[PDB]
C-alpha cells in the first residue's frame with residue numbers, strides 16, 4: 001500500500017504542516033504530482049512500525065536523533081545530494097544526518113529550547129533557576145504562576161538535568177560509549193531533584209503537559225514557559241508581549257538543552273525516491289519554500305545558508321542559537337530511543353512520587369544501558385563446529401513458556417529463578433545447565449533435590465513424573481539468553497533491584513511497537529536485525545519477571 005507518482009509526507013503536529021502543504025501545492029502545480037501532508041500522533045513511533053511492513057509515507061520529518069535507529073533497521077534511503085547543493089547548507093547540519101558515513105536525511109532546520117517570558121508580568125527574566133521558587137511566591141500573590149512547561153516529555157526537562165552534569169552517552173575522544181550512560185550521576189540527581197522540589201512545593205504541577213503550558217502562557221496566566229521556535233506563531237496571534245532569552249542557570253552552570261536538527265528522510269520502501277529528491281532539494285530547501293513553512297510556524301535557524309542570513313537578524317533566533325551553543329547537539333545513534341524512553345519514565349515517576357529520584361534515575365540508567373547494549377549489533381558473532389527446528393512464532397513460544405511456568409509450586413518457581421539467575425553473565429554456567437536439562441529430556445533423572453538440581457527437581461510434577469514441557473521451556477529460555485551478550489549484566493541488575501517491569505515495558509515500546517505483529521515466519525537466517533536480539537531480551541525479561549512473580553526477587 002505505497003502509491004507510485006504521489007508524495008505522502010509525515011511531519012509533527014506542532015510544526016508548520018499547512019505551510020509545507022503550500023509548498024506541496026506549488027510542486028503539484030509545476031510537476032503535476034499530488035502531495036499529501038499528514039500529521040499522525042506518536043509520529044516517530046508509528047513510522048518504523050509502518051515502514052517495516054513496506055507501507056508508510058515517502059518522506060518523514062523528525063529531529064535527527066530518531067534517524068540512526070531508522071537507518072539501522074534499513075527504513076531510510078541513502079540520499080545522494082549534488083556537491084554543489086551540499087554547499088548551500090551549513091556543514092554541521094549534514095553531520096547530524098550522517099550515520100556510519102552515509103547521509104540518511106536532508107537537514108532542514110536547527111531547533112533548540114529557549115526561555116520564553118512575558119514582559120508585562122515580568123520585565124526582567126531570572127538569570128538563575130534557583131530564583132524561580134521565590135518569584136512564584138510573588139506572582140502567586142497576583143493570581144499568576146512563575147513557570148509552566150511540559151513535564152511529560154524529557155526534551156523539556158533535560159536541560160535542567162544536564163546542567164550540573166547529566167549526560168546521555170559519554171563522548172570522549174570523539175566517539176560515544178554505549179555502556180557509559182550519565183543519568184545516574186550526581187549532577188543529574190541534583191537537577192532532577194530540584195525539579196521535583198518545585199512540584200513538591202506546589203510551584204509546578206506534575207500533570208502539566210504541552211497543551212496546558214502553552215494555553216496558560218498565551219492566556220497570560222503564567223510568567224514564563226520553555227519551548228522551541230514552533231511555539232512563537234501561536235503566541236504572536238495571542239495578545240501577549242513576550243521575549244525569548246537564554247535558559248536560566250542551575251548551580252551557576254548553563255542549562256544544556258538537547259539540540260535537534262529537523263530533518264527529512266526518504267522511505268526506503270518508496271518508489272518515488274527521485275520525486276522526493278526533487279521536492280526536497282529544489283522546492284522545499286529554497287528561500288521561497290522555507291519561507292512558506294516558517295511563516296506558518298517557525299522552523300528556528302534553518303539549515304539553508306541563503307535563507308538563514310535573513311532569519312539571523314531576528315532576536316529570537318539569536319536567543320535560540322545562544323541556547324543551542326550552551327547545549328549539546330543530539331547524537332543520531334539508535335540507542336537514543338533507549339535513552340529517551342528510560343528518562344521519560346524516570347522523570348514522570350519522580351515527579352508523580354511513584355519512585356524516589358535516586359531510584360528512578362538508577363533504573364533509567366540500567367534500563368537505558370541494557371537496551372542500548374541490545375541495539376548494538378556490531379561485532380556480534382558465534383563459535384562452533386541437537387540444534388532445533390523450532391517451527392514456532394516467537395509470540396507463540398513465549399505464550400507457551402509462560403503457561404508452563406504459571407502452573408508451578410511457589411517453592412519450585414523460586415528454585416527455578418535462583419538457578420536461571422546464576423546463568424546471567426556466566427556463559428559456562430548457562431552451558432552446563434543446558435547440557436544437564438538436555439540430558440534429562442533425552443534420558444531419566446527422577447524426584448529428588450540438590451544444591452543446583454533444585455531446578456532439575458522442578459521439571460518433575462507433584463507425582464514424580466517428568467513434564468517435558470518444562471524442560472523445553474527452560475531450554476527455550478536458555479537459547480534466548482544465549483543471544484544476549486552485554487545486557488545480561490543489566491538484566492541481572494533489574495532482577496536484583498526489582499525493576500524488571502520497567503525494563504519489560506521499555507523493551508516492549510522499542511520493539512518497534514507491536515509484538516503480535518513483530519513475529520511471523522520462523523527464523524530463516526535471512527532476516528536478523530535488532531529484531532532477533534530484542535526478542536530474546538524481551539523473552540528473558542518476561543520469563544524472569546513471571547518467575548519473580550507479583551513482589552519478589
Ligand SMILES: OC[C@H]1O[C@H](O[C@H]2[C@H](O)[C@@H](O)[C@@H](O)O[C@@H]2CO)[C@H](O)[C@@H](O)[C@@H]1O
Nearest residue numbers: 012014063065066153154155156260340
Ligand atoms: O521528548 C523526547 C523527544 O524529544 C525530541 O523530540 C522533540 C523534537 O525536537 C521536536 O520534534 C519537538 O516537536 O519536540 C519534540 C519533543 O516533544 C526528540 O527528537 C525525540 O527523539 C524524543 O522522543
